[PDB]
Design a protein around this ligand. Sequence first.
Ligand SMILES: [Fe+3]
Length: 822
Amino acid sequence: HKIKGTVVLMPKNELENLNAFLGRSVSLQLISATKADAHGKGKVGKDTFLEGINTSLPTLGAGESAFNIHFEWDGSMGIPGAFYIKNYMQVEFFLKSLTLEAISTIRFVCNSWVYNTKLYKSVRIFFANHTYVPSETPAPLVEYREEELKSLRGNGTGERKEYDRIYDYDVYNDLGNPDKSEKLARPVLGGSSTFPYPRRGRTGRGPTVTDPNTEKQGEVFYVPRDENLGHLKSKDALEIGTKSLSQIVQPAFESAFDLKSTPIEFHSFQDVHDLYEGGIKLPRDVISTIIPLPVIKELYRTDGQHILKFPQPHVVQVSQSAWMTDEEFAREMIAGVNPCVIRGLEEFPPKSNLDPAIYGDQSSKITADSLDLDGYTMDEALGSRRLFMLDYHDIFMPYVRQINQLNSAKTYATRTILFLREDGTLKPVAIELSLPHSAGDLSAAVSQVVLPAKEGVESTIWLLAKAYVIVNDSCYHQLMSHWLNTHAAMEPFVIATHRHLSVLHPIYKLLTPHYRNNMNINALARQSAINANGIIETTFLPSKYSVEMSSAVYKNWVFTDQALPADLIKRGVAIKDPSTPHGVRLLIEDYPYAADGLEIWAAIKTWVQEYVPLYYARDDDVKNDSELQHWWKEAVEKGHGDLKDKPWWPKLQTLEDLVEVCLIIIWIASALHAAVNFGQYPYGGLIMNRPTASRRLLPEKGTPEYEEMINNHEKAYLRTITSKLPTLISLSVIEIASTHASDEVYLGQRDNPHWTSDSKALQAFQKFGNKLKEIEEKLVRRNNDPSLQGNRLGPVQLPYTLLYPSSEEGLTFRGIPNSISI
Ligand SMILES: [Fe+3]
């Protein structure tokens, strides 16, 4: 007459004795999926308490404890499909799972914090691991299913508390700190035509005293409780790093500089190399402040007394000087940290769409006859699809004036012309350094064109020109390729999924692994990374204009252009070609990001195309899923609501649209983010290779600054790029971001083998993981192919492993997480 059950939970201390969980501490009630009361709701059993510690199980995961329990459940009550749980203890615990035996085995995958019962307005409910579209929900669970969605949505008011599980939207009005200073006021991003932006998770702290449109500061930025990931190992809590760096480590660094205990500036390139060789000497109390901090202490080796040493960046591990080569500068545009901006150039000279009345004549000054195209004429280079560009002219020109008015910031709007050589590598052939020009200008600095040069002061000017380009590129990488296109663009879909797709829903099960830790890292970023005077503003060129620049770019963000084939075709780096395996022909055949990416894209596509038909037999079945239609309607009209008028949104009335939408979401969250994230320290850990800021324009002839370019080119370079103090802070941030936590869940993995009971879904997922293993072998062969050495390894001899699916923990330059997790 009893159902044997096993509860697995983790006491709180395991993620930030066992006998306290016995007695009347924890009650569970089974809920029937087949026998309903007179209202049609599945009947509920009696409160049943944990009976004892099970120590006979083969071996739980670390930190987990198993509890025995027996439910009076006579069979007339039908088959359990859910349960209620009440925690009568003062302290919350993490509920892993319930397992019921000898009844048609029943598994519940919970993985949820359960706070004291008096904190909840309705009792926590958990469903068995079956999957149902809404029309397939067993009738006695239909109302339970919808009431749980209503509970997760909340009502759009109230200050969110730690234990709340309420998902909702708000604008980016929480970055400014106007109550501290008018200088820290920031425009609201989202909800206007001037500043469109993805929505983020609502926190509801309320208004500042000086500005009803800006949300007040808080010690903790709320996320729904189970988004805030605990870790067994403190060192895996990498998301706490940015707060520690901004609030604890940066002031300690600043004091070392204020007290003149270390040189204020780098004076040679070797001063930079020293950081990962002998290290940097700092005051004792500065070391003492840093080396006890979780996560932070993992970033540096130390003698415990005066030395911090950074890890040797991958980009210098074979050749310290290879970053300086034109070969490597161009190669990193297709296999570097930001491999997804280069475009084909199909006319010459390049054109601008900006208004000459505002910025002056926008004609390019690059002349065709000045370029070395390995003997090709311009017409030949254009017609054979060998001309490409890295075009930041129109992106940066609207912000150059305001950036350059800042005291220690000076930039150009840059364009780089690239030629695809017959050997398949890219060659840079010109850089245009543009400045706006209008009648009222007080500056006499002018735009100019710089061409490659290997000797003399011309070689230094060309090296500086490359630095100005990479400052543009690093800013666009950090704020657009990375922050906007992954972190910020994904959060609206996270929110919508939890608000409108039941945990029971097949598309919830398909997508939610790809959201792990995303809202958490994003909230911590709003607090410490992209806030006024936060990490990004105090290390990157645009300073207080950084985040709003990403809103300007979001005006042109197109959901369907995030698909890899559409991206490659839009950028003119591939053409449609049905005769090829992936339906596109690359115009740069050995384009490592794109060629490896197409393999990953195709594997995800096959997986989604196999999973969707398990639950939707026909287009009509997609049309008639009420949760799915509400999910997509809200994702578009609210989550990305500033772009809800755009004609390119899929309608989601067909199987093909459902596949496309899920495929793109998974792609952004896993491989796209990985490709743009985990190369940050490997390439940018040498500040000269990936400068974050430029502080001066090119010097005029006849000046001491010009003579310095002749007599001391390294110092000229270092004075132009990011200063030493923001370099230390920035290196630390990108080292965190390039690190895989040991509890990461990678593409092809899931945190629990029982996420669904449907064997066809589980077998399809196994095929997907096998396919990713085969792809990794293929990518290994690519990196070992000497014919591809030029673009896949370069003179830095750094094999392109960023789209290898698998990785061990640490700073590995490989591995594709499921989600945007750091
Ligand atoms: Fe990231």
